[PDB]
Amino acid sequence: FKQRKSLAIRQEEVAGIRAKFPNKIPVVVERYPRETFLPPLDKTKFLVPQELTMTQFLSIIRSRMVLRATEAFYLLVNNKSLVSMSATMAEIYRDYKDEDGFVYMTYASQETFG
Amino acid sequence: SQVIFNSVEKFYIPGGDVTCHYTFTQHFIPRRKDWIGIFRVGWKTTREYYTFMWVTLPIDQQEVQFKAYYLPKDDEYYQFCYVDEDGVVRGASIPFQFRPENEEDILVVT
Numbered sequence: 001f002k003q004r005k006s007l008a009i010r011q012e013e014v015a016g017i018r019a020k021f022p023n024k025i026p027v028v029v030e031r032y033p034r035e036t037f038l039p040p041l042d043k044t045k046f047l048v049p050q051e052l053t054m055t056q057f058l059s060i061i062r063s064r065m066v067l068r069a070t071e072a073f074y075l076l077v078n079n080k081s082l083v084s085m086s087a088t089m090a091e092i093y094r095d096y097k098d099e100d101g102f103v104y105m106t107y108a109s110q111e112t113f114g
Numbered sequence: 115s116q117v118i119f120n121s122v123e124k125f126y127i128p129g130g131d132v133t134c135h136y137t138f139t140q141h142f143i144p145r146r147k148d149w150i151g152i153f154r155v156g157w158k159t160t161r162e163y164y165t166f167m168w169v170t171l172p173i174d175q176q177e178v179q180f181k182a183y184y185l186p187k188d189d190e191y192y193q194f195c196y197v198d199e200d201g202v203v204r205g206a207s208i209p210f211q212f213r214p215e216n217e218e219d220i221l222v223v224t
Contacts, residue, residue, distance in 0.1 A: 020216075043219055043220070044220075045217075045220045045221070046220075046221050047222045049224070
């Protein structure tokens with residue numbers, strides 16, 4: 001959501017989040033904009049434990065779907081990056097974290113990159 | 115000084131009624147046109163109150179309730195101030211915002 005909020009506002013949100021939950025990783029999760037199949041979330045910002053795997057985090061994301069979908073799908077960091085689902089949130093944060101202090105993920109059932 | 119606010123939250127959920135808790139100090143004498151009002155922090159005068167309640171009566175550790183409709187909509191800082199019949203502020207609370215502490219799009223994972 002870089003388009004809705006300014007860099008400084010996002011940095012401030014991260015500051016506040018980190019002040020209340022200094023041990024969590026703040027994660028902005030977004031439905032792939034061209035997704036026609038999977039339902040939207042009731043949540044946007046997910047505060048996750050360092051040790052949580054990408055797989056467990058995918059199951060959480062699934063649990064926040066406003067309709068029930070059991071179907072398999074993809075979790076794309078930055079919407080550009082296919083990553084190991086055995087990876088912990090600490091590693092994703094170390095390697096993929098945004099300049100604003102957020103890690104971004106897009107969930108999609110299918111995607112074609114150029 | 116003479117009036118003191120207790121159990122003041124840093125955060126008050128929008129749409130909920132706000133219970134304001136206050137206690138008079140040993141030598142303070144409350145009067146019946148005394149009132150408690152909610153002020154933007156940085157209020158210049160007591161005539162700048164956003165909303166108000168008369169000091170609750172009858173008087174025998176006090177509270178007054180503010181209905182949700184009349185509470186500030188914005189993200190600004192506010193505080194309670196006690197104003198007596200002479201226009202003198204006798205006490206002022208820590209500041210607060212009318213807003214969830216955690217925005218609702220946030221999900222904490224344990």
